[PDB]
Amino acid sequence: MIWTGLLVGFLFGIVLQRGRIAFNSAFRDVLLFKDNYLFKLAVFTLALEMILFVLLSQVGLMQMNPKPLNLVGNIIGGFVFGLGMVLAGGCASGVTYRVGEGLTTAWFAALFYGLGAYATKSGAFSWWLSWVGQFKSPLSVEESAYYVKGAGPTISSVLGLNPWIPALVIAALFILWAFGTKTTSRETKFNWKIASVCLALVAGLGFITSTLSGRKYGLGITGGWINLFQGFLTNSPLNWEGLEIVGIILGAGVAAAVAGEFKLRMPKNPVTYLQVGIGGLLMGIGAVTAGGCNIGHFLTGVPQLALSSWLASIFFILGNWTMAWILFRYQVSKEIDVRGEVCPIPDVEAKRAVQSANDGEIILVRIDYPASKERIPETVKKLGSEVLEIEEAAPGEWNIYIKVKK
Amino acid sequence: MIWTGLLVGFLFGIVLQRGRIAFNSAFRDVLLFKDNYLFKLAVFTLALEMILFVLLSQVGLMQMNPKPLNLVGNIIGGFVFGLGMVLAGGCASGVTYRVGEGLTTAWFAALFYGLGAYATKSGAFSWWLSWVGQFKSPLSVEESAYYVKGAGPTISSVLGLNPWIPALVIAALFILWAFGTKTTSRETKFNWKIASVCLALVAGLGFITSTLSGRKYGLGITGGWINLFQGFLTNSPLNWEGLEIVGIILGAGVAAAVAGEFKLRMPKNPVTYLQVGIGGLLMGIGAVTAGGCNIGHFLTGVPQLALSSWLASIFFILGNWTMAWILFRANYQVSKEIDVRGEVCPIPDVEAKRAVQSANDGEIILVRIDYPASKERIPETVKKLGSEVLEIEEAAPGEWNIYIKVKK
Ligand SMILES: CCCCCCCC/C=C/CCCCCCCC(=O)OC[C@H](O)CO
Ligand SMILES: CCCCCCCC/C=C/CCCCCCCC(=O)OC[C@H](O)CO
Ligand SMILES: CCCCCCCC/C=C/CCCCCCCC(=O)OC[C@H](O)CO
Ligand SMILES: CCCCCCCC/C=C/CCCCCCCC(=O)OC[C@H](O)CO
Ligand SMILES: CCCCCCCC/C=C/CCCCCCCC(=O)OC[C@H](O)CO
Ligand SMILES: CCCCCCCC/C=C/CCCCCCCC(=O)OC[C@H](O)CO
Ligand SMILES: CCCCCCCC/C=C/CCCCCCCC(=O)OC[C@H](O)CO
Ligand SMILES: CCCCCCCC/C=C/CCCCCCCC(=O)OC[C@H](O)CO
Ligand SMILES: CCCCCCCC/C=C\CCCCCCCC(=O)OC[C@H](O)CO
Ligand SMILES: CCCCCCCC/C=C\CCCCCCCC(=O)OC[C@H](O)CO
Ligand SMILES: CCCCCCCC/C=C\CCCCCCCC(=O)OC[C@H](O)CO
Ligand SMILES: CCCCCCCC/C=C\CCCCCCCC(=O)OC[C@H](O)CO
Ligand SMILES: CCCCCCCC/C=C\CCCCCCCC(=O)OC[C@H](O)CO
Ligand SMILES: CCCCCCCC/C=C\CCCCCCCC(=O)OC[C@H](O)CO
């Protein structure tokens, strides 16, 4: 049973890698650049999961298990996890799958993420988690077809409604907005509509299989990394979530390689390793304090209508916003080289290069992250210019050619 | 008492950084390049430590505590630790102080070193350590002024001699060879003679203070990294050796910064991270299997005349050699420039040598480096080729331009 985590994690990783599904980017870019592509993906997926999780519970394939409510932990830990997201150059699922893509910064961030989460759970930061534990809400639900006994409060349970009703109302609202609203364009072939459907299916598969293996929950990140570290350092057995992490990495790597997008990568400046290192530590403290991360709380907990998960997600986003302001703000006439610069940067340095350019000029942009080669084309068409061709130099490296137009 | 580890480690770290004392380089370059500078440093320090450890035991400031003999562990672990050295681009002390010099590769290699050693002591590789433990030799010494009760066999104990006698004989032979033999030349101002005296003084100080904190041993590395990880991950208290590691890093960092040699650094090719990560893991498994590392066994154990330490050191060197073969088999006109910034030492020296030979008479050679050891080795490699170094200028902090005029 436990070995189904490797399979679910493998599929999870392919979807994350092919879709460029980075929630840290989704929260950040909806503030910095009014980009909602990844936010539409998130909302549509949450909507599908809302319908799927209650449907799968109805027919007896799983029970929902909302995480307990803890206002101090969910808020403070949520917020601190939001800060670390931006510093580490991605949320925990994003860091995890970028490991298999070949980014050494993500190797660094995952190490400090795992160690910091381990340390907050049972080591040098245990005292903090103990202090936060006193503020846990005693509110719980009773065993039913929908809920594991003793789980945390939901929108349904507070309202006294069958979980089907808020699930359908909220999802329909989510879908109305996702579809009745304009979305930022991207060149991703694995587009946000079909990625949402795949991601939710993988989500349901994970809740089912993980439950059979004795972990009554769907996809998560933080507990998988702690299960792996416990295994290596204490010889404890691996569990479903530990194997899911392995699967994510392996799946993202396979998917990157087959797409010719795998490449061992380094940042432009060495100090980034210090940044993503501190960032990963903040994430480990935040996630453990909060009781879950971008996946455990947001992708998996929100569609269960868990109050803890809605609350922690609000502060995931506010922390992301705080840290994002702290950190941010063929002839060939000019050449900009943004290889190894953090995923916001290539789009920003290519926008500023097209603006600070004369008409008819041909600009070369050098990138080595595939998310940017599907974002810069749209930023270019909304500036008057047009992309001539995206040519692959090395594997995992692409040259973008732009003809400026007024 | 435990806090004296930070002090001793801080001093230990300064001496390593200033002297460029990297034993992995010491073993490798004596085979690759017939370079014996760092090996005279090691041999002289060992000699000074042999006299010092016994003298300090005589007057009651410490007792020696030779590590136990284990042929399977000391040989196989020593050899595996040898392979890891070269892959990680530095031994365990070299990786540790390079963390303070700002090498992100050292950060990486330390992480996998600490985790691999922890996993070998009590995690997923403990099965191997258990299997090795069955071969432990029951040989041991009795409590005396010289020895902790139950410590492992020494040259003295096997010979039935007062520890002073093999100590003075072997050290005198070491000092004869060190001073009666030519040594490879270097530009290091903290030269191998004055560095050996300081290193041995710091070594003795560590043996004294650590013993007062309840760890009857001198300088080590692997235990401190495990003590650190245990504290962070399980909330256990830090001991003298964990604080010694912290000291080492702080010490090298201050020393590098004051010398204007500190710089956050990246390797030339990203795969180096995979390399040094695997290397650090090999070191963790090897050091724990061997019962000690370049410091715990070689620097601290050999002067105690501990059979375990002499034996494991033999295979540290054999493993280093094996891996060394697998792996290594201003206005100035400037005719050609070689940029070896971020390339792993021996490479700057190697690519600078090849560049001078593959060049025409009178050509001006610009070598770009960013590791401070290389700027004291390349000058001698150049003079033994006929050419001469015009000037070594500082480009960035931690970065140097070497200008070579090629003759004939
Ligand atoms: C296992 C061989 C390769 C190990 C490379 C470790 C490098 C350092 C990374 C640490 C965190 C993740 C470590 C995950 C390693 C697998 C988990 C493990 O050791 O499992 C033990 C098992 O559960 C007992 O029954
Ligand atoms: C804590 C971690 C536990 C362990 C997790 C391990 C998961 C599996 C690894 C995936 C990486 C995949 C590597 C893919 C390498 C691709 C190489 C490539 O694409 O080479 C191109 C070249 O140009 C020739 O065509
Ligand atoms: C040869 C290298 C250069 C010269 C280096 C000289 C260093 C000092 C010499 C010490 C050896 C003394 C040996 C004899 C000591 C007296 C006899 C003795 O102690 O005998 C013990 C007995 O055999 C059992 O307990
Ligand atoms: C108390 C009894 C035991 C003492 C134990 C420790 C002894 C250390 C010194 C040994 C002799 C060293 C002689 C070295 C003389 C110099 C080297 C030499 O002869 O030639 C080189 C040249 O003359 C100059 O650099
Ligand atoms: C009784 C034992 C024997 C006596 C032990 C005495 C204490 C140890 C040495 C202290 C400082 C040594 C470091 C100094 C090394 C040379 C420094 C130097 O040359 O610095 C000048 C300038 O700042 C750059 O060129
Ligand atoms: C107290 C503040 C600690 C900040 C840690 C940031 C670095 C985290 C990296 C982990 C790998 C290196 C492990 C060494 C960690 C030493 C610090 C530590 O927590 O030691 C245990 C503590 O002293 C027991 O009470
Ligand atoms: C987590 C494992 C244990 C970690 C233990 C850490 C102990 C303190 C050492 C830090 C590095 C060295 C000190 C920092 C040196 C900074 C030098 C610097 O910034 O130099 C500026 C430059 O010279 C232009 O002005
Ligand atoms: C244990 C060491 C640290 C591990 C940290 C997490 C690793 C996660 C997976 C990465 C794929 C690694 C293998 C795939 C890449 C191989 C290198 C490559 O593609 O090229 C190498 C070149 O051919 C010759 O140097
Ligand atoms: C370990 C790293 C932590 C990093 C982050 C530190 C943030 C600031 C600290 C605390 C805020 C506490 C906020 C809540 C405090 C009041 C809770 C409360 O109600 O206290 C009274 C109680 O209900 C009846 O005694
Ligand atoms: C329950 C209702 C839904 C059931 C079905 C859910 C699973 C869909 C299956 C595969 C994903 C396909 C991803 C879309 C892109 C496929 C590839 C493509 O469009 O072109 C590739 C190109 O030709 C170069 O390989
Ligand atoms: C260590 C033993 C296991 C080794 C690992 C074997 C994993 C299974 C292999 C392939 C299935 C998944 C295929 C994933 C395809 C990703 C999407 C993709 O890139 O599709 C091609 C497209 O043409 C690009 O544009
Ligand atoms: C096993 C892991 C061990 C620990 C691994 C982490 C590193 C520890 C050492 C030094 C940190 C501080 C180094 C100095 C920080 C400033 C350096 C500098 O000059 O920064 C310039 C930059 O542009 C400004 O943003
Ligand atoms: C007694 C038992 C002895 C043996 C026990 C331990 C076995 C490990 C052996 C060799 C590892 C060789 C180094 C492998 C490094 C990984 C590949 C890599 O990093 O590839 C790129 C690199 O640059 C290419 O040289
Ligand atoms: C230092 C002793 C530590 C403990 C034992 C570890 C193994 C020693 C290595 C070889 C044994 C034979 C040594 C024979 C004496 C001369 C050695 C020699 O020539 O030194 C190397 C180099 O050639 C100079 O240029």
Author numbering:
A (entry chain B): 1 to 329, 374 to 450
B (entry chain A): 1 to 329, 372 to 450
Quote the passages of the study that discuss this structure, keeping the authors' original sentences.
Recently, a selective thiosulfate uptake pathway involving a membrane protein YeeE (TsuA) in Escherichia coli was characterized. Here, we assessed selective thiosulfate transport via Spirochaeta thermophila YeeE in vitro and characterized E. coli YeeD (TsuB) as an adjacent and essential protein for YeeE-mediated thiosulfate uptake in vivo. YeeD is a cytoplasmic protein that belongs to the TusA (tRNA 2-thiouridine synthesizing protein A) protein family. Finally, the crystal structures of S. thermophila YeeE-YeeD fusion proteins at 3.34-Å and 2.60-Å resolutions revealed their interactions.
Introducing a mutation in YeeD (L45A) strengthened the interaction, as found in binding experiments using purified YeeE and YeeD mutants (described later). The mutants E15A, V16A, C17A, D42A, Y43A, E48A, and R49A severely impaired StYeeD’s affinity for StYeeE, while the mutant L45A enhanced the affinity. This enhanced affinity could stabilize the crystal packing of StYeeE-StYeeD, leading to its higher-resolution structure. Therefore, in this paper, we introduce Mol A of the higher resolution structure, which shows the best electron density map, to explain YeeE and YeeD interactions. The cytoplasmic indentation of StYeeE associates with StYeeD, which consists of 2 α-helices and 4 β-sheets. While the important, conserved residues C293, C91, and C22, termed the first, second, and third cysteines, respectively, are arranged perpendicular to the membrane at 8.6- and 6.7-Å intervals, C17 of StYeeD, one of the YeeE-interacting residues, is the putative enzymatic active site and is located adjacent to C22 of StYeeE as the “fourth cysteine. The distance between the third and the fourth cysteines, 10.8 Å, is wider than that between the other cysteines, and this space may be needed for transient binding of the thiosulfate ion rather than its transport. A water molecule is located at position III, a predicted thiosulfate-binding site. The relay of a thiosulfate ion from position III to C17 is likely facilitated by the conserved positively charged residues R28 and R98. In the 2.60-Å structure of StYeeE-StYeeD, the electron density is faint on the N-terminal side of the CPxP motif, raising the possibility that some electrons may be attracted to the CPxP motif.
